[PDB]
Design a protein around this ligand. Structure first.
Ligand SMILES: CCCCCCCCCCCCCCCCCC(=O)OC[C@H](COP(=O)([O-])OCC[N+](C)(C)C)OC(=O)CCCCCCCCCCCCCCCCC
Ligand SMILES: CCCCCCCCCCCCCCCCCC(=O)OC[C@H](COP(=O)([O-])OCC[N+](C)(C)C)OC(=O)CCCCCCCCCCCCCCCCC
Ligand SMILES: CCCCCCCCCCCCCCCCCC(=O)OC[C@H](COP(=O)([O-])OCC[N+](C)(C)C)OC(=O)CCCCCCCCCCCCCCCCC
Ligand code: SF4
Lengths: 62, 87, 105, 66, 67, 71, 44, 153, 158, 70, 86, 58, 318
């Protein structure tokens, strides 16, 4: 007896989509910058990101 | 900022997809309700900053905001007894 | 996200700076604090350079001393700081390790 | 200017106003320290600073014709 | 007073016309000839046992009280 | 408690970053000052340093284009 | 008499009564509880 | 660039507000003026006031204007000054701003935390300057009882 | 004929016909007691929505018209005006026995002898009133009709 | 309409006898218990089986006294 | 240059609003919308000033004048809608 | 496998009804087969009154 | 540079798939409620029903309107569509799994709702007949009243937790779901979300429009309505039920990807929408606006006052 599962199933697809939806951009960004997104970047973290990037490029070039 | 750039790129991409989807097949009651909304909407506008900062303000903040709410609530009561929101 | 600079140079790399900030505060502190008093007197980037050079020397010395005593651990610790950009609440496990093998004080 | 800088710190151009005020209200001698008004208004508008930098570039450009 | 029309569930065929005022129905009036057949004329040009089905057809929800 | 942990870490790491950026600023300002002096030799000398803002209070340069530390 | 009038009004307008009671609770808590709590924290 | 775009849109849309007929067209161009002004404020770096311009200016006042002009649809009864302010030599010549572009001095000490403008504005407006906040309550109350006594028979 | 292209055309017609048959949207015209039985069809027993069928009221977005009942000389213009306002692909199902061929009151004034005179009926149905089974079988016959609707081929050969 | 004012008073003076009655009726109309009861009945029917005769494969019941194609 | 551009935009919008309220004399709707435009320009240059010279009271003033503008607009449109009943 | 899967099994995926009848079959028994080839089943029991005799059309 | 359009496409398309299957599941579950099956012929389980309906509405012979036939009639449906989606921009599906961390998200959502009101009113008036215009005015008034109620509810949930960006809110809930203590607040917010999109008991505007036009235009309009429905469900579960956080905090739940939790909560709320639709008759318009301006505004305001009070007397307020 699983007759109810015929109704959640279409709804269930939505779930999938939503999950997929989110995950998509996540992994996209994970490949576009090398690490996952960061929630709530105050100015401090942006300055730190710029400085770290410049420092690492200087170290790589040398 | 630097997030409203993703926002606006979303805006233009949504415009594009919507146009694509479009091209494929080829009185006093209202006025007073609007006024009451224009009056209670700055209420929400003012409640937004008051919401975030109820830790760097002692009961003085809560009381000032409650006095504002009381003035506008007497406004709402006068509105009610006049029956302008009767419909 | 390497923190070694292909040599002994500990390459500040702000992630590493925070990872040690859990720890720096008890080595150069007093020395460090004098710097701030300079900056309180006159925020003149000229007349407050000696103390800053001193603090940078002390901190780079700390990083050298601390990257050798804890190497593997520290590596993975910074390996879990670049990732999870700077959130301490994430992979606290590595932090735990960085207090067992590494220098606690 | 009052103190409340746009991000919760002593505003960029406060200290100058504080000195201006303490001198204008403490020693009421007539405009002996109107010298600080130029300073405070400069902080508000950088007028002297922009003028100086503009002139430096002006002369740099004038020596290019040679 | 507006003069609105109403020609609609499938709750039968009927034509209401409404003298209106704001949201008040000052005067509603139905037009009803929209489904006529001549049942009486037919019964006459018909019989008793042959005309029983006509009564069956009138008021087609309650289909036996008529007979 | 968590936010305070994070902010305390930032505070303790502040001075290294501050000193490094201060040294960078001194380097760039010395560059600009040498440039000025070089293009202001024969002009009637006016104290090449030229603290246009008198009464101390070093007052960083603060170029135009309001809110520069955002975009 | 006044109790009868109040019971009548509360039966008639339940949601306004509940709103007023919630607002009364939310205004009574600070005004009369904060001093007591500050005194308790002062004594312990 | 985009600053100039928003400014130009706002300018031309205000022109249409004043000149273009079919008053519903005027109200549309007015909404558009406010939208681009909100985007402009967003560019300035003040986000809260941008969203507020969206909510109360556009979503609240302009909808009232649209309502009223809807019910009465059938009721159809500088270059000199710009040069004078751009030839002052008190504005930095853009060539200067180039090299000095790499001259700003970050502090790294006033941004260990960061008050978003919403938070600091709340602080200031409610603790101090509070009577400045009680009076607008009275003017809103005046607005609503005025609407009532005027139109409500 | 480019036999490959004829196969692609056949598949395109199959897809088109399958969509048009599986998303059909009727439009009720409930004059007389058949409406009741039609409701019984749309009821829980012989469910209609199961076949992808939604009784859309507005005649600007419907596909079929189900004339269920009995026309009347007073009602013919309204029915014709409703029929005209539909999009191009249309079908008409004549329920009952007087919506098609006059039926009983066929022998009476003030009755149109069958809705065939006003709109070009597609498939009628028999009944008095048709058993809900009979109406559902009529709609399945309409599916079988719309299923032999090679259309893209006609445009490719026109 | 003078009587309606008088009737509405007694009807309120009758149900509002004690405090328990007014309190019960108030949180009754304030916590939507009849709404919840209707929702629970509906959800039961949802979980329950269906009718849905599935026509083209199992037709409906008839009787030898039927009428059809002559 | 950016303060110049912001302020000149605000000034030209103010000028446009006053020209609207002066030239057009009968259409009350255009009149009230021009008043709204004037208050909008005032608000915008208030904000630009609040951010140029680092000082906060500009934004408190901006919020309060927003309240004032909403009140005037509502009440004036009431005046109009009672004028156009006759 | 694939033989009967193509014969009368895989059509259910875009046909729908055949899936319901296959379920009723896994519950079913057999009672007849008619010259047109079609199979009549009867899943008599605790099922229901309306749906316990049906036919797969072959 | 090119990652951003990729993210935007990955946000847009799955939403359309999900909303098509949303209307499908809507029909199915209302059917099951009413003791009947839904669409079960076309697909294996009716899964190919929305695709078939879409193909039908595509091949259907179009009819261009005769009322401001450009730049005012062929734009407003696109306007409401763009508004719904740009609202969908900032919603957190997991830790950092967002599109934009707009640090004032709540104000953003509220503003976008008001702009949707603009969309519906201009789409109503852009037609020719006037009864559609009266219906548009009615819908606008209803929408804006329940928006002010939604605003006060947002102010409550905001008071409970300092910042505004939604990830911070879902952490605050990571302690304990705000739905638990403010359960009546959740009920009021849900009723206001119902009235905001005119779905379950408040339909008399649409019912009257059906009692008294382009195929693709109507399709776009219904698409906008149901997309706004999913959005309202999403923010309701993102600020009153946890937002990708396992229940009871036991390290067997922590194997579930977190994103699954958000989908489960939003699907539950969608099911509740459809369920409360098929159990209740509709209000009138009079009683509708009366409840909007008499029952939900005072209750919401009182709740703001009460929660502020309880959270300002004790040192419980961050
Ligand atoms: C995984 C997703 C499953 C969704 C539900 C499947 C349908 C269902 O439960 O039907 C009820 C039926 C059972 O009910 P039933 O339809 O036999 O009803 C008779 C009455 N009761 C409920 C008492 C038995 O479920 C099954 O038969 C399950 C086994 C067969 C599953 C076949 C799946 C085919 C998929 C093809 C694509
Ligand atoms: C070929 C089957 C493709 C998969 C099933 C499907 O989507 O069928 C839709 C419907 C099904 O049509 P149909 O079921 O009416 O006829 C095709 C019958 N078979 C599968 C046995 C060949 O349309 C098509 O499949 C059109 C061709 C593919 C595009
Ligand atoms: C310290 C604080 C302590 C708090 C203790 C608890 C107090 C709770 C008070 C607020 C309750 C909020 C929820 C009920 C509510 O809002 O009712 C408003 C109102 C109650 O008032 P009413 O309008 O129904 O009242 C009956 C009608 N009159 C006014 C004429 C008497 O609810 C409704 O109107 C219901 C509308 C229909 C809803 C249909 C969808 C239901 C969805 C599922 C719900 C489960
Ligand atoms: S037998 Fe025919 S004429 Fe009579 S009620 Fe039925 S559909 Fe109508």
């Amino acid at each position: 007896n699983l007759r109810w599962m015929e109704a959640v199933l279409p709804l269930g697809i939505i779930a999938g989509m939503l999950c997929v939806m989110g995950n998509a951009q996540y992994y996209i960004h994970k490949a576009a910058h090398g690490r996952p997104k960061h929630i709530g970047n105050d100015l401090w973290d942006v300055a730190m990101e710029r400085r770290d990037k410049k420092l690492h490029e200087q170290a790589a070039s040398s | 900022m630097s997030e409203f750039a993703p926002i606006c790129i979303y805006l233009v991409i949504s415009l594009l997809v919507s146009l694509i989807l479009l091209g494929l097949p080829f009185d006093i009651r209202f006025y007073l309700v609007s006024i009451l909304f224009i009056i209670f909407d700055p209420e929400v506008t003012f409640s937004f900053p008051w919401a975030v900062s109820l830790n760097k303000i002692d009961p003085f903040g809560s009381w000032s905001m409650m006095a504002f709410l009381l003035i506008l609530t007497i406004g709402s009561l006068y509105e009610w007894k006049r029956g302008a929101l009767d419909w | 996200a390497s923190a070694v600079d292909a040599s002994g140079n500990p390459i500040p790399s702000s992630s590493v700076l925070m990872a040690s900030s859990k720890h720096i505060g008890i080595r150069c502190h007093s020395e460090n604090l004098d710097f701030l008093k300079c900056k309180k007197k006159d925020p003149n980037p000229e007349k407050c350079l000696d103390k800053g050079r001193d603090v940078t020397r002390c901190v780079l010395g700390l990083l050298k001393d601390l990257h050798q005593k804890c190497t593997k651990e520290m590596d993975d610790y910074v390996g879990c700081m670049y990732y999870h950009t700077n959130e301490f609440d994430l992979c606290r496990k590595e932090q735990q390790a960085f207090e067992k093998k590494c220098s606690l004080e | 200017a009052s103190g409340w800088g746009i991000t919760g710190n002593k505003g960029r151009c406060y200290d100058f106003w504080m000195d201006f005020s303490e001198c204008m209200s403490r020693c009421r001698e007539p405009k002996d320290c109107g010298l600080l008004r130029e300073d405070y208004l400069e902080c508000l508008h950088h007028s002297k600073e922009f003028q100086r930098r503009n002139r430096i570039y002006k002369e740099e450009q004038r020596k290019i014709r040679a | 007073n507006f003069t609105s029309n109403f020609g609609p569930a499938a709750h039968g065929v009927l034509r209401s016309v409404l003298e209106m005022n704001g949201e008040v129905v000052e005067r509603a009036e139905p037009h009803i000839g929209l489904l006529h057949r001549g049942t009486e004329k037919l019964i006459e040009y018909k019989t008793y046992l042959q005309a029983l089905p006509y009564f069956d057809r009138l008021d087609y929800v309650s289909t036996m009280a008529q007979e | 408690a968590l936010k305070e942990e994070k902010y305390a870490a930032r505070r303790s790491i502040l001075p290294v970053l501050q000193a490094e950026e201060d040294e960078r600023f001194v380097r760039e300002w010395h560059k600009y000052l040498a440039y000025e002096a070089e293009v202001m030799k024969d002009v009637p000398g006016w104290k090449v340093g030229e603290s246009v803002y008198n009464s101390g209070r070093w007052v960083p340069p603060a170029s135009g284009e309001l809110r520069p530390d955002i975009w | 008499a006044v109790m009868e009038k109040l019971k009548m009004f509360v039966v008639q307008e339940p949601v306004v009564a509940a709103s007023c009671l919630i607002a009364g609770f939310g205004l009574f808590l600070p005004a009369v509880v904060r001093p007591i709590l500050d005194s308790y924290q002062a004594t312990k | 660039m985009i600053l100039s775009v928003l400014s130009s849109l706002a300018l031309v849309s205000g022109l249409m507000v004043v000149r273009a007929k079919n008053p519903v067209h005027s109200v549309l161009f007015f909404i558009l003026v406010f939208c681009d002004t909100s985007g402009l404020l967003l560019l300035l770096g003040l986000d809260f006031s941008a969203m507020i311009f969206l909510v109360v200016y556009i979503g609240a006042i302009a909808v009232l204007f649209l309502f009223v002009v809807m019910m009465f649809h059938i009721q159809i009864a500088l270059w000199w000054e710009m040069f004078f302010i751009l030839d002052n030599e008190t504005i930095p010549l853009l060539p200067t701003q180039i090299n000095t572009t790499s001259l700003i001095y970050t502090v790294y000490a006033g941004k260990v935390r960061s008050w978003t403008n919403l938070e600091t504005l709340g602080n200031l407006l409610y603790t101090y300057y509070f009577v400045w906040f009680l009076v607008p309550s009275l003017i809103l109350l005046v607005a609503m009882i005025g609407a009532i006594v005027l139109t409500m028979h | 004929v480019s036999k490959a292209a004829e196969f692609v055309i056949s598949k395109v017609d199959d897809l088109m016909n399958w969509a048009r048959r599986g998303s059909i949207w009727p439009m009720t015209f409930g004059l007389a007691c058949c409406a009741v039985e039609m409701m019984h069809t749309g009821a829980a027993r012989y469910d209609l929505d199961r076949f992808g069928i939604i009784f859309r009221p507005s005649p600007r977005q419907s596909d079929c018209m189900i004339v269920a009942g009995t026309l009347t000389n007073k009602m013919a213009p309204a029915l014709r005006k409703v029929y005209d306002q539909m999009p191009e692909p249309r079908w008409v199902i004549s329920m009952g026995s007087c919506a098609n061929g006059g039926g009983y009151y066929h022998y009476s004034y003030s009755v149109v002898r069958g809705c065939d005179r006003i709109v070009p009926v597609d498939i009628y149905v028999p009944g008095c009133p048709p058993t809900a089974e009979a109406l559902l079988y009529g709609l399945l016959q309409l599916q079988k009709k719309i299923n032999r609707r090679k259309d893209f081929l006609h445009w490719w050969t026109k | 309409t003078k009587l309606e004012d008088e009737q509405r008073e007694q009807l309120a003076k009758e149900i509002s006898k004690d405090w328990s009655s007014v309190f019960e009726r108030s949180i009754n109309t304030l916590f939507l218990t009849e709404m919840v009861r209707g929702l629970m009945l509906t959800l039961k029917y949802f979980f329950e089986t269906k009718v849905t005769i599935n026509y083209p494969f199992e037709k409906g019941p008839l009787s030898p006294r039927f009428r059809g194609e002559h | 240059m950016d303060p110049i551009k912001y302020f000149t935009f605000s000034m030209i919008i103010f000028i446009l609003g006053i020209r609207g309220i002066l030239l057009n004399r009968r259409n009350i709707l255009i009149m009230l919308m021009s008043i709204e435009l004037m208050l909008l320009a005032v608000n915008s240059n208030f904000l630009v000033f609040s951010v140029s010279l680092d000082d906060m009271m500009g934004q408190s003033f901006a919020l309060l004048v927003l309240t004032v503008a909403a009140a005037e607009s509502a009440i004036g449109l009431a005046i109009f809608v009672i004028t156009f009943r006759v | 496998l694939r033989e009967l899967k193509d014969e009368g099994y895989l059509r259910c995926l875009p046909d729908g009804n055949l899936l319901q009848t296959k379920i009723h079959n896994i519950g079913a028994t057999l009672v007849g087969v008619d010259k047109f080839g079609n199979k009549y089943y009867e899943k008599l029991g605790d099922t229901q009154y309306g749906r316990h005799r049906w036919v797969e059309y072959a | 540079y090119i990652a951003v359009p990729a993210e935007i496409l990955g946000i847009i398309l799955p939403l359309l798939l999900g909303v098509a299957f949303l209307v499908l599941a809507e029909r199915k579950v209302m059917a099951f409620v009413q003791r009947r099956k839904g669409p079960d012929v076309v697909g294996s389980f009716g899964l190919l029903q929305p695709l078939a309906d879409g193909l039908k509405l595509i091949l259907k012979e179009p009819i261009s309107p005769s009322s401001a036939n450009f730049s005012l009639f062929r734009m407003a449906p696109v306007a409401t569509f763009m508004l719904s989606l740009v609202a969908w921009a900032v919603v957190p599906f997991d830790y950092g799994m967002v599109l934009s961390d707009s640090n004032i998200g709540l104000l953003y959502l509220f503003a976008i709702s008001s702009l949707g009101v603009y969309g519906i009113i201009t789409a109503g008036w852009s037609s020719n007949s006037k009864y559609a215009f009266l219906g548009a005015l009615r819908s606008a008034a209803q929408m804006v009243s329940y928006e002010v109620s939604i605003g006060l509810i947002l102010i409550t949930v905001l008071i409970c937790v300092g910042s505004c960006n939604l990830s911070e809110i879902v952490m605050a809930q990571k302690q304990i779901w705000f739905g638990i203590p403010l359960f009546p607040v959740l009920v009021m917010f849900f009723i206001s979300c119902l009235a905001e999109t005119n779905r379950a008991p408040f339909d008399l505007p649409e019912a009257e429009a059906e009692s008294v036009y382009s195929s693709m235009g109507s399709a776009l309009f219904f698409l906008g309505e149901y997309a706004n429905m999913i959005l309202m469900s999403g923010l309701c579960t993102s600020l009153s039920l946890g937002g990708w956080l396992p229940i009871l905090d036991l390290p067997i739940f922590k194997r579930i990807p977190g994103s699954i939790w958000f989908s489960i909560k939003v699907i539950l709320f969608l099911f509740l929408y459809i369920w409360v639709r098929a159990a209740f008759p509709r209000y009138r318009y009079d009683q509708l606006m009366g409840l909007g301006w008499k029952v939900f505004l005072p209750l919401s305001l009182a709740w703001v006052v009460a929660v502020s009070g309880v959270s300002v007397t004790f040192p419980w307020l961050p």
